[PDB]
Amino acid sequence: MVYKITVRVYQTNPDAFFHPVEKTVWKYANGGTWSITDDQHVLTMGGSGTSGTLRFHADNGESFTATFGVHNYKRWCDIVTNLAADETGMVINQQYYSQKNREEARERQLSNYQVKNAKGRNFQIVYTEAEGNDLHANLIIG
Amino acid sequence: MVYKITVRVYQTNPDAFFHPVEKTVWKYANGGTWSITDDQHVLTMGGSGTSGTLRFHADNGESFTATFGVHNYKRWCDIVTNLAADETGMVINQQYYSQKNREEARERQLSNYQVKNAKGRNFQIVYTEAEGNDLHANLIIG
Numbered sequence: 190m191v192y193k194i195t196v197r198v199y200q201t202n203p204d205a206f207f208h209p210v211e212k213t214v215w216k217y218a219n220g221g222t223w224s225i226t227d228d229q230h231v232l233t234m235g236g237s238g239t240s241g242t243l244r245f246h247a248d249n250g251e252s253f254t255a256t257f258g259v260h261n262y263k264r265w266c267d268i269v270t271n272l273a274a275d276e277t278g279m280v281i282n283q284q285y286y287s288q289k290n291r292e293e294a295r296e297r298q299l300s301n302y303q304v305k306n307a308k309g310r311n312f313q314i315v316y317t318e319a320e321g322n323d324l325h326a327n328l329i330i331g
Numbered sequence: 332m333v334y335k336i337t338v339r340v341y342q343t344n345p346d347a348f349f350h351p352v353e354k355t356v357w358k359y360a361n362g363g364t365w366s367i368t369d370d371q372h373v374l375t376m377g378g379s380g381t382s383g384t385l386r387f388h389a390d391n392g393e394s395f396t397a398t399f400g401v402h403n404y405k406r407w408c409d410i411v412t413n414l415a416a417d418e419t420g421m422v423i424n425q426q427y428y429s430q431k432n433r434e435e436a437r438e439r440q441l442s443n444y445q446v447k448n449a450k451g452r453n454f455q456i457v458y459t460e461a462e463g464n465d466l467h468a469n470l471i472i473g
Contacts, residue, residue: 210364212354213421214386220419222352222388246364274361274377279421 192237194257194264194324196230202310205251207330211244211278215258215286237262240285240295243328244278253312254281255328263298264324266314267291270306305331332379334464336399336406338372341471344452347393349472353386353420357400357428379404382427382437385470386420395454396423397470398437405440406466408456409433412448447473 200207209230212223219235223243232241240258253270269281284291294302300319305311311331318325342349351372354365361377365385374383382400396411411423426433442461447453453473460467 208366210366211356212365214353214419216417216419216422219416223354224350224352275358277356277358277362279355279424280358282421 190236190322192234192259192322192324194232194234194241194259194326195226196232196243196255196257196326196328198230198328198330200330202331205247205249205310207245207247207251207253209243210246210252211242213242213244213279213282215239215241215282217286232257234259240265240282242278242282244272244281245330251306251308251310253306254278255312255314256282256285257314257324257326258285258295259324260295260298264300264316264319264326265295265298266302266316266326267294267299268302268304268312268314270304270312332464334376334379334401334466336374336376336383336401336466336468337368338374338385338397338399339370339467339469340372341469343471344473347389347391347452349387349389349393351385352388352394353384355384355386355421355424357381357383357424359428374399376401382407382424384420384424386414386423387472393448393450393452395448396420397454397456398424398427399456399468400427400437401466402437402440406442406458406461406468407437407440408444408458408468409436409441410444410446410454410456412446412454442468
């Protein structure tokens with residue numbers, strides 16, 4: 190059955206402004222689509238076992254990836270900060286199915302995750318609808 | 332050596348409606364960003380030698396990828412209409428730097444390319460500004 194993850198982005202700090210610069214979809218479970226409905230990023234997936242990655246960028250150099258997916262019928266999420274120049278969104282998205290620490294993050298099936306970058310800025314994902322096929326999550330930027 | 336490719340999408344046939352469902356950026360040349368300015372898709376790249384893939388999807392089931400980038404200081408593009416169910420945009424984008432047939436398609440440095448899918452719908456990419464670091468291309472859907 191189709192899984193959908195609707196993401197709302199909350200920027201709370203005026204000292205920086207992030208905007209999406211990359212939207213990727215993993216190939217498993219017949220892939221999926223990244224779309225927009227009323228300023229909401231909607232990830233529609235063909236089933237459980239795949240994911241999608243949003244990469245954001247602020248004009249001050251700061252950047253992070255926010256990956257949302259469904260592993261064994263349960264939602265998961267992870268945030269990667271301090272990205273290298275050759276660490277684009279498609280690079281990160283694939284790592285959750287090849288790189289050990291990333292695979293463990295997905296297998297944790299978190300309804301919420303929190304991490305900071307080197308500058309101290311906090312990034313959080315919180316699933317407000319954390320069960321079923323219609324998932325909703327807030328992306329909160331500190 | 333920063334390159335920018337501005338893409339304008341033209342849909343000419345009311346029997347279908349396509350919309351972007353994936354925007355990827357290849358990791359080479361310090362990667363880059365996919366952005367939006369006045370309904371135009373803007374691919375900014377840190378240098379020559381990388382690319383970005385836009386995957387489009389119609390509600391009838393039709394899909395294709397339009398990849399734009401710079402190879403050897405000249406613009407290039409390619410359209411893939413025979414998307415496998417496990418071939419998302421990030422899959423296609425990487426193949427231009429791993430699969431020989433896609434490598435050759437990139438190294439041809441096309442500023443103009445036309446191709447159809449199995450249903451007979453035509454897809455076209457034309458660079459109206461095919462010179463310099465500020466490149467401009469039309470994506471015309473038949």
